[PDB]
Amino acid sequence: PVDPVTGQTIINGEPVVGRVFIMQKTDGTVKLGKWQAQYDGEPTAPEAANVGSSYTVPAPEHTRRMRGIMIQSTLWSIDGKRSARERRHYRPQTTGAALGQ
Amino acid sequence: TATDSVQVGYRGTGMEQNYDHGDLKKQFAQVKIPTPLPPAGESPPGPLPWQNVQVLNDISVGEFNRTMVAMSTWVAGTGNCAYCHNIANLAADTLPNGKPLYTKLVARRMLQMTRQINGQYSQHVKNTGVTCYTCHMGKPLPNGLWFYSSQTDYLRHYLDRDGARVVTRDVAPSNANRSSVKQTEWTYALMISQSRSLGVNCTYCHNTRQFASWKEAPPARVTAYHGILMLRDVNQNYLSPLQPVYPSVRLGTQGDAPKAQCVTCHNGNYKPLYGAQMVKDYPALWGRADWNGVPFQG
Amino acid sequence: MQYIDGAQIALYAFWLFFFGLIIYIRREDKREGYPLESPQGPREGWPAMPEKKTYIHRPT
Amino acid sequence: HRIWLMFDPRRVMVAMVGFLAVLALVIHFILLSSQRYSWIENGTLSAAQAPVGASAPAAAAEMSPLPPG
Amino acid sequence: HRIWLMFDPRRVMVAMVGFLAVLALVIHFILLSSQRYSWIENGTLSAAQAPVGAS
Amino acid sequence: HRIWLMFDPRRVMVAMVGFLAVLALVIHFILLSSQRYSWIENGTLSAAQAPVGASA
Amino acid sequence: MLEYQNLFTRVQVRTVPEAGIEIDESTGTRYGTGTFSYLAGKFGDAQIGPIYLGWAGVLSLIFGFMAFEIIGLNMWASVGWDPVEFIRQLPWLALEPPPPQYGLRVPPLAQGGWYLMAGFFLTISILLWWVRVYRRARALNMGTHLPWAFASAIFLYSTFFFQPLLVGSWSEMVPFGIFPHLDWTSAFSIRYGNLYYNPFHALSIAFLYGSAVLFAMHGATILAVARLGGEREIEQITDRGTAAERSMLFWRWTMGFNATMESIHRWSWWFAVLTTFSGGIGILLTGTVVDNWYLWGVKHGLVAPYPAQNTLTEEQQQLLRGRYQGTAPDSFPSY
Amino acid sequence: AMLSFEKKYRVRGGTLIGGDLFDFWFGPFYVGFFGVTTIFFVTLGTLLCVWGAAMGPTWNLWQISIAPPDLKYGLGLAPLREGGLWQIITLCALGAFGSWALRQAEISRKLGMGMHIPWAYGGAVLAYATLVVIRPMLLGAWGHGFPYGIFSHLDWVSNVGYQYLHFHYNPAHMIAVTFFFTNCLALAMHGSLILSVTNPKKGTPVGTSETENVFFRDLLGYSIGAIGIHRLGLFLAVGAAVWSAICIVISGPFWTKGWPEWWNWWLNLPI
Amino acid sequence: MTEDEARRFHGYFVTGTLGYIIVAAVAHFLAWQWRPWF
Numbered sequence A: 001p002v003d004p005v006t007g008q009t010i011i012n013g014e015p016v017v018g019r020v021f022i023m024q025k026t027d028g029t030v031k032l033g034k035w036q037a038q039y040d041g042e043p044t045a046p047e048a049a050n051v052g053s054s055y056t057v058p059a060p061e062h063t064r065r066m067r068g069i070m071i072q073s074t075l076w077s078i079d080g081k082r083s084a085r086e087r088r089h090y091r092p093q094t095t096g097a098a099l100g101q
Numbered sequence B: 001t002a003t004d005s006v007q008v009g010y011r012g013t014g015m016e017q018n019y020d021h022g023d024l025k026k027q028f029a030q031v032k033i034p035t036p037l038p039p040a041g042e043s044p045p046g047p048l049p050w051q052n053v054q055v056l057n058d059i060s061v062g063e064f065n066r067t068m069v070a071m072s073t074w075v076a077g078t079g080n081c082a083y084c085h086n087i088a089n090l091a092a093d094t095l096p097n098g099k100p101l102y103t104k105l106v107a108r109r110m111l112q113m114t115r116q117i118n119g120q121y122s123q124h125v126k127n128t129g130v131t132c133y134t135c136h137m138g139k140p141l142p143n144g145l146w147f148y149s150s151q152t153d154y155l156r157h158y159l160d161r162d163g164a165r166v167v168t169r170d171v172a173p174s175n176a177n178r179s180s181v182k183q184t185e186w187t188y189a190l191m192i193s194q195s196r197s198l199g200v201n202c203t204y205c206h207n208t209r210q211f212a213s214w215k216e217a218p219p220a221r222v223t224a225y226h227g228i229l230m231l232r233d234v235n236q237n238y239l240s241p242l243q244p245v246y247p248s249v250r251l252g253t254q255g256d257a258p259k260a261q262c263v264t265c266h267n268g269n270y271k272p273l274y275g276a277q278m279v280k281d282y283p284a285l286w287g288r289a290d291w292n293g294v295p296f297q298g
Numbered sequence C: 001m002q003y004i005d006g007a008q009i010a011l012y013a014f015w016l017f018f019f020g021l022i023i024y025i026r027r028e029d030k031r032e033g034y035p036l037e038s039p040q041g042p043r044e045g046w047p048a049m050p051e052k053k054t055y056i057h058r059p060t
Numbered sequence D: 001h002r003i004w005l006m007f008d009p010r011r012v013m014v015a016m017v018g019f020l021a022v023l024a025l026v027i028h029f030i031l032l033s034s035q036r037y038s039w040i041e042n043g044t045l046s047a048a049q050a051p052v053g054a055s056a057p058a059a060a061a062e063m064s065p066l067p068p069g
Numbered sequence E: 001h002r003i004w005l006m007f008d009p010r011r012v013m014v015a016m017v018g019f020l021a022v023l024a025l026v027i028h029f030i031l032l033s034s035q036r037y038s039w040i041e042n043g044t045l046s047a048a049q050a051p052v053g054a055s
Numbered sequence F: 001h002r003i004w005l006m007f008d009p010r011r012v013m014v015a016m017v018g019f020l021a022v023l024a025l026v027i028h029f030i031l032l033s034s035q036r037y038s039w040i041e042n043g044t045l046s047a048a049q050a051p052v053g054a055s056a
Numbered sequence G: 001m002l003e004y005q006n007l008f009t010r011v012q013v014r015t016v017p018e019a020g021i022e023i024d025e026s027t028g029t030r031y032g033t034g035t036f037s038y039l040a041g042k043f044g045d046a047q048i049g050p051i052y053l054g055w056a057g058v059l060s061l062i063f064g065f066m067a068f069e070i071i072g073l074n075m076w077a078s079v080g081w082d083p084v085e086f087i088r089q090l091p092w093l094a095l096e097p098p099p100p101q102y103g104l105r106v107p108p109l110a111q112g113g114w115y116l117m118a119g120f121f122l123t124i125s126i127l128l129w130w131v132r133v134y135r136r137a138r139a140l141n142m143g144t145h146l147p148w149a150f151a152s153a154i155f156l157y158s159t160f161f162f163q164p165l166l167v168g169s170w171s172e173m174v175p176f177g178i179f180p181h182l183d184w185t186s187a188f189s190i191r192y193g194n195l196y197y198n199p200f201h202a203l204s205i206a207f208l209y210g211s212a213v214l215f216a217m218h219g220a221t222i223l224a225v226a227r228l229g230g231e232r233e234i235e236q237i238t239d240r241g242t243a244a245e246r247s248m249l250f251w252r253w254t255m256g257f258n259a260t261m262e263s264i265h266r267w268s269w270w271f272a273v274l275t276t277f278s279g280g281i282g283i284l285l286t287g288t289v290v291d292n293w294y295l296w297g298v299k300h301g302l303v304a305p306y307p308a309q310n311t312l313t314e315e316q317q318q319l320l321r322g323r324y325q326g327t328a329p330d331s332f333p334s335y
Numbered sequence H: 001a002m003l004s005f006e007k008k009y010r011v012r013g014g015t016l017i018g019g020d021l022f023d024f025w026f027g028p029f030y031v032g033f034f035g036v037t038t039i040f041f042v043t044l045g046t047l048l049c050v051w052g053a054a055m056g057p058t059w060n061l062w063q064i065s066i067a068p069p070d071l072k073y074g075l076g077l078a079p080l081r082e083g084g085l086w087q088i089i090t091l092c093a094l095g096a097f098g099s100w101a102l103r104q105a106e107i108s109r110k111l112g113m114g115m116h117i118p119w120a121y122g123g124a125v126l127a128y129a130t131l132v133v134i135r136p137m138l139l140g141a142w143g144h145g146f147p148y149g150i151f152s153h154l155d156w157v158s159n160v161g162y163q164y165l166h167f168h169y170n171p172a173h174m175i176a177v178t179f180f181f182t183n184c185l186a187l188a189m190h191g192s193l194i195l196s197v198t199n200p201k202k203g204t205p206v207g208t209s210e211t212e213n214v215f216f217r218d219l220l221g222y223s224i225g226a227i228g229i230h231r232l233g234l235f236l237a238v239g240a241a242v243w244s245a246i247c248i249v250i251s252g253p254f255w256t257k258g259w260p261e262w263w264n265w266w267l268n269l270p271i
Numbered sequence I: 001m002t003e004d005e006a007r008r009f010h011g012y013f014v015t016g017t018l019g020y021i022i023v024a025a026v027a028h029f030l031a032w033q034w035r036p037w038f
Ligand SMILES: CCCCCCCCCCCCCC(=O)OC[C@H](COP(=O)(O)OCC(O)COP(=O)(O)OC[C@@H](COC(=O)CCCCCCCCCCCCC)OC(=O)CCCCCCCCCCCCC)OC(=O)CCCCCCCCCCCCC
Pocket: C016, C017, C019, C020, C021, C024, G142, G143, G144, G145, G148, G149, G151, G152, G154, G155, G277, H195, H199, H200, H201, H202
């Protein structure tokens, strides 16, 4: 509360000489508590994963030869060579009977 | 070489964005915004003299031609009715021989798409919407077009995949989260692509000491999440269903319609066109009744 | 229990082993040049002096 | 001519050739990396068509090359 | 002349051959990496059709 | 001057040449990195068209 | 002008190559006679001498070469057998572990079977090399300190097999590749919540830095007293000369305490061994006892507070919740 | 106290600054002019660190963090409560490390030894100076330094590493990591070799210098010398720090994109 | 050494310095005419 006559801050019924400010630590930081309290204000837990019930084998032309997980963002995003791009997937296949040979 | 650094987190955390000064200046200089067309706000109180118009129905006539000039300069070029119309019959959806005008049908669907983006996804494009120019930049083909390649292509995160979280919300392991290190690598690749699409680094949306935390991350992360959801709408309900309209040269090797990603609008910038505001002066593209208190005539 | 977990238990086991190891290596560090020379007499820090160690030499 | 009794001409010639060659390479590469004097690509343009650096520029509205701090 | 007294001809000739080879390789590779002078792909173009730096 | 009996002329000359070369390179590069004196790109501009820093 | 820094040797002395101390040769023998390299003799010893080969060494070479061949051939097949692409893209190529849905069951040959074969052969060859190191040590009546340091290295290596077995999937193993194994390192840290807060990871980092510190200190100390015969450490240990005395006094005057010529090598041995031992413990604890090391650090008071960078509303907390990652789409939908 | 052989070595001379005033021993420590300067800087820096801990929200040893200033104060001395204290502590640390190196040089000049130890410590000093002086100066702000906190400087390292998307792809980082790993391997091998020769199979005599070379020649086919192993250890340990300084100084001042993209040059070779 | 070559070297060094300085003065005047910095 502020005294309406002298414009002075009052603390526990006593006036203070000076410009009262609320003390705080460096940049308003507060010590962390329990780990479960790290989710106060954070979004709720994510939902269960979407896992396909069945699996259909793709065509060879739609299958990657390189099984590295991060190959699309680490190499292919910066690689643009035509033949190198061609060797990224398997080639389409058939049978001798289907070719009439 | 001077480096322009922008602090995005608390001091000492290491959350900063670095830029090379020379290339940043060259890249910023080369952008050329089309000048806004002079407003047309004195049309007569008459009915619409339009035969085949199912989108621009709430718009006056003079502002209709204003929008048409803007659309031409944004997609095809100044003037140039020949890219979407035939000069003789502007209301015709088909060529004189009989073939339908696919560019005009695409432009109609994409008028609807632009209105949907500006109206239903304000949480991403706050007060700075999009026009045809943001994606097209004066050309008929935008950037970042992608098609079906393989199952583990992370761009499917913007079409039909859902869920990218891998981090456990507990100290101890359980069956609530059984993510593999490979799934973490997939998320890493997707986020590297996002970072390069906006020209930023990981700390723009993350405090990397805990990637899962939203309170320790800058507000941009929230915006980024909405940008995912918007894309999933755009790619599912507007771009993909346009498969039977395009000629075969437009589709992919599986014969599917081109789709959009973050770099389609952003083109390697934290904001499209460095945050240029263009749609505030083109009410036909708004999805709202007002942009910045400026009301929509109707 | 709840606050105690396996990582903490293993960490304190490692701390105990590391302190024992440091004690052993400091015992070895005083095999030459001890006891110290001081006006108050012979001096031994902690850990105290180890027993005398002799090597083996091949016959001539 | 008494300068050569102070410094070995062999050392001076080595340092001179090295410094002058490094300077020539650096200048040629600085010019080649520029926009006005990238002669391998744009050397056929006339002096009027050659790029010129921008003069005293104007400001911009609601457009920042840098993200907010 | 008298330079061969101050400099060994063997050393000078080896250094000169090395420098000339490196310089020729660097120039050829710079030209090959350019757009106007990528002669392996566009060498059949006439001088009016060859790419020019935009300005 | 007696300074040459106090300082080796070879040492002083080498130090002076090195310091001068580094200083000249530093000044030329500072000018090249600036906006007003980036002469390789904007050297054909007149004194009126050359950039000037703002009053900020 | 400068004092001789003992960095390089200017005058090399040659002699007949040293055949080696007489050792048992019932199961293996020495190959070569001993050649001399001048360039190698500038920095250290010059003799590229004979090498002993026995049972364990030959078996280790066979198994290791089989693993190396499997890895290389899978890398080569991944680029369509293109030698140009093989050399150009070599750092990005990998032999990848099986898919996560197989758990610990055997995978298809083209989807992780080769990986397990190569890993098994590499493991067998590493163990056989350990046997060879032990036997070479005991053939010369030496102590087995090197075998038990190599054992610590092998312990850290074997955690890359035991942790995926404990979490229950061979998909969590380290891929065979230059860049992809770095990718796995990064993704492993990210998946389990900032491995910086693993206490045993911090411990192993302390021991690795301390190994660098100790070797810099010991090498500088021995080079600084090599003018007094300090590099001959065996004799300075069994008959302490002025070089060892000065080495002790330098560090006693510097940091207040010192070691001896022999116990500084005990310090070095233990720092190097502990680097891999504590790291192996830290890896074994991840995903089995602790799934989020940042949250463990918050629980045990390791994490410094920062001001919040963002605040979320009640509807935002429900909206911003995501979904755990699932399987990739096996269909190409038409809309 | 003094070692059994210590007394004959404690003589006068060898100092760089000062004379008989600062030429004494405090306990086992030698005090010179640079010993006094080291004490001054250590005391001032440690007391300022304790004050920074007192200003912060906790006394927990792991959570204490004295952070550098904001980037907006670039190259200027920020207010004490807003990062200026970090700058003063940095000045104290620089003074203390320089004084430690010079005092070590005085000590080695007094025992007749070479000058290797101060120069070896100079590599670590150079790495630290690159972290807090050279790189922040090139980037133009003192706020590019790392905070002084046991686990907060780990957070700084993590965020700075992810500033370049994938920091593993830094070539100089790869070379420095190789140096560190090879150094640890070589240290293990050297310690094992010396201990196994001086502590052989029980019942057998102490081995000779030829046993070391014969063992390593039998195992690897090549055995570096007794002087060679110490030269190699010094080179590996110091080169690790030098290549670390190189790797951190090129990130930001010279390269601002993601490190993986830097490998374009290799994929675009004309062949 | 004989204090005469000191005078001779001083003359040579002084004239070299003076010429370098005047040539720098011409360069600065030329640059001022092209684009003044004050
Ligand atoms: C792949 C998977 C593995 C992955 C990880 C692998 C890690 C490997 C760690 C290995 C640790 C030892 C390393 C070492 O120096 O090895 C050299 C030595 C071979 O020497 P040698 O060839 O025989 O040469 C003979 C001679 O030259 C040895 O002299 P050296 O100087 O090398 O060794 C000195 C000996 C002296 O021994 C003694 O004084 C006897 C008492 C030693 C301590 C016994 C109790 C230890 C604790 C027990 C509970 C331990 C509980 C944890 O000293 C040593 O070798 C070691 C000295 C002590 C090291 C620090 C100990 C700190 C303990 C702190 C405890 C907490 C205090 C609060 O190898 C040995 O194995 C030596 C011991 C051989 C006798 C058997 C000992 C075990 C018997 C019981 C188990 C029997 C088999 C089931």
